[PDB]
Amino acid sequence: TFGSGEADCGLRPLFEKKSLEDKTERELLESYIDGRIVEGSDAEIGMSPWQVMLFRKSPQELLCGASLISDRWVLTAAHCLLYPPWDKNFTENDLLVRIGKHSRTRYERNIEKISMLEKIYIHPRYNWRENLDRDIALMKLKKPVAFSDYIHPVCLPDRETAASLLQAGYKGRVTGWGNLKETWTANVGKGQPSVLQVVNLPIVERPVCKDSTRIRITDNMFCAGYKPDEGKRGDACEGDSGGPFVMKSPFNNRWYQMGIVSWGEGCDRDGKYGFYTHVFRLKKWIQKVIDQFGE
Amino acid sequence: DFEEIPEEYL
Ligand SMILES: *[C@@H]1O[C@H](CO)[C@@H](O)[C@H](O)[C@H]1NC(C)=O
Numbered sequence: 500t501f502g503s504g505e506a507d508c509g510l511r512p513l514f515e516k517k518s519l520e521d522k523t524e525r526e527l528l529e530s531y532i533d534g535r536i537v538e539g540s541d542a543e544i545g546m547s548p549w550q551v552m553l554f555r556k557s558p559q560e561l562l563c564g565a566s567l568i569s570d571r572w573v574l575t576a577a578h579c580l581l582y583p584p585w586d587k588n589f590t591e592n593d594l595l596v597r598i599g600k601h602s603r604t605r606y607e608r609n610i611e612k613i614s615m616l617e618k619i620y621i622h623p624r625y626n627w628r629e630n631l632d633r634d635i636a637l638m639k640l641k642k643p644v645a646f647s648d649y650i651h652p653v654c655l656p657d658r659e660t661a662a663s664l665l666q667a668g669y670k671g672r673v674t675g676w677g678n679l680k681e682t683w684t685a686n687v688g689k690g691q692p693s694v695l696q697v698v699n700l701p702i703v704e705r706p707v708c709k710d711s712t713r714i715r716i717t718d719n720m721f722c723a724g725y726k727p728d729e730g731k732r733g734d735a736c737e738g739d740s741g742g743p744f745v746m747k748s749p750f751n752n753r754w755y756q757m758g759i760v761s762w763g764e765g766c767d768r769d770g771k772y773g774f775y776t777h778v779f780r781l782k783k784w785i786q787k788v789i790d791q792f793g794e
Numbered sequence: 795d796f797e798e799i800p801e802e803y804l
Pocket residue numbers: 581583588589590
């Protein structure tokens with residue numbers, strides 16, 4: 500009964516289970532949006548238990564974000580492992596996952612768990628040639644992981660959750676170590692987090708998304724971000740490529756993963772957004788690598 | 795920046 504449903508998904512040991520709220524979750528909780536545009540504070544300990552860190556064995560580097568959905572399965576962006584134009588083509592043995600982390604650089608003794616990958620499953624139809632369509636990969640751990648106060652799975656959405664939550668005006672939440680900030684000409688100061696960060700962004704209407712990029716946007720993608728303007732606290736660019744985009748159901752109080760951080764736009768000063776893979780549309784793919792896979 | 799992780803994970 501792996502990711503074919505998971506009972507405890509999205510109820511966080513330190514918040515929901517103790518009837519405790521994080522310092523910003525009410526924002527997700529409006530229905531209307533106009534208003535609290537929170538900046539991108541540091542995460543609270545246990546605020547995001549499903550957060551994963553893809554780690555390059557050697558040279559030891561933080562490759563991307565990822566999310567815990569089972570005790571044996573991790574979800575990321577396929578571009579994190581396979582991207583011909585950049586000679587990117589990772590294998591099982593080239594990475595490790597790191598679950599249970601806050602600090603970006605410390606090994607976190609007695610908290611994090613580092614595991615090996617057994618197999619990587621890229622969607623057969625992911626499109627690196629043009630726009631990164633079907634940017635989803637699944638990694639099955641080399642051995643199951645024990646949930647902790649710090650380590651817990653997020654829920655995968657179902658038809659109705661996707662239907663009611665995925666909507667223009669509704670805030671979602673990204674978390675990550677800011678690997679979406681992969682500059683050159685930059686002089687990244689007041690940055691490169693020490694600790695995991697968090698920001699709540701509003702989902703954007705399809706046409707407004709299409710009309711801000713030159714990229715051909717498909718049905719498998721959504722965009723979120725505040726309106727390039729005067730006061731726009733919160734940046735998409737604040738996450739990690741392959742990391743999680745999540746909403747808290749107002750019906751059942753659980754946390755589901757609605758998107759995977761795909762690319763960001765005008766990640767500099769020009770008012771663009773973040774693009775994410777639409778988890779609900781790719782879900783039957785997921786449904787079956789799992790329901791029928793492992794090695 | 796990355797602190798070294800146990801030789802046991804490679
Ligand atoms: C990625 O590299 C593997 C060997 O690691 C190769 O078999 C595979 O075809 C490559 N994917 C491509 C070329 O897109």
